[PDB]
């Protein structure tokens, strides 16, 4: 069969790595916000936006993870829905 199935899984992991990096940097910014100006309501608004962005990132990496399950474990199955 096609080994590309696992090469595509590799790509997904590489994309997850970039997603994780971004998420960690967003958490770093949240730390800066909370530590410094966490009492500021406008800073809270910034933090909220960041938290929402992180949520998106976690969804993206989760969807990729479910794709990994298919490509890696059960590529002969039908785990498309994820």
């Amino acid at each position: 069969t096609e080994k590309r199935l696992l090469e595509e899984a590799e790509r997904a992991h590489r994309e997850q790595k970039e997603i994780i990096k971004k998420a960690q940097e967003l958490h770093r910014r949240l730390e800066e916000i909370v530590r410094q100006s966490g009492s500021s309501e406008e800073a809270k608004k910034e933090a909220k936006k960041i938290l929402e962005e992180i949520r998106e990132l976690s969804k993206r990496s989760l969807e990729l993870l479910r794709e990994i399950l298919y490509l890696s474990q059960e590529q002969k199955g039908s785990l498309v829905p994820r």
Binding site: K3, L6, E10, Q16, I20, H27, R28, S72
Partner: protein, 77 residues
């Protein structure tokens, strides 16, 4: 069989990673809840700072899990 061991290894990592996602999102929402909750304080900020660390550490583990399975994919390519 050794193929079954591989399948179980894949499940171990992937299933764990999915649980890590859950834990991260639970903390993520907790951070939001604290901010949106009225009557915030210095101790509330301390809570968030600790939560931020935890979620980062989870992201660290998550990355390592992805790297582990990524190397598996290479070897089994």
């Amino acid at each position: 069989g050794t193929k079954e061991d591989i399948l179980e290894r894949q499940r171990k990592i992937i299933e764990r990673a999915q649980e890590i996602h859950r834990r991260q999102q639970e903390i993520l929402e907790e951070l939001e809840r604290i901010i949106r909750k009225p009557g915030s304080s210095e101790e509330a900020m301390k809570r968030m700072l600790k939560l931020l660390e935890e979620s980062l550490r989870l992201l660290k583990e998550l990355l390592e899990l992805s790297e582990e399975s990524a190397q598996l994919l290479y070897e089994q390519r």
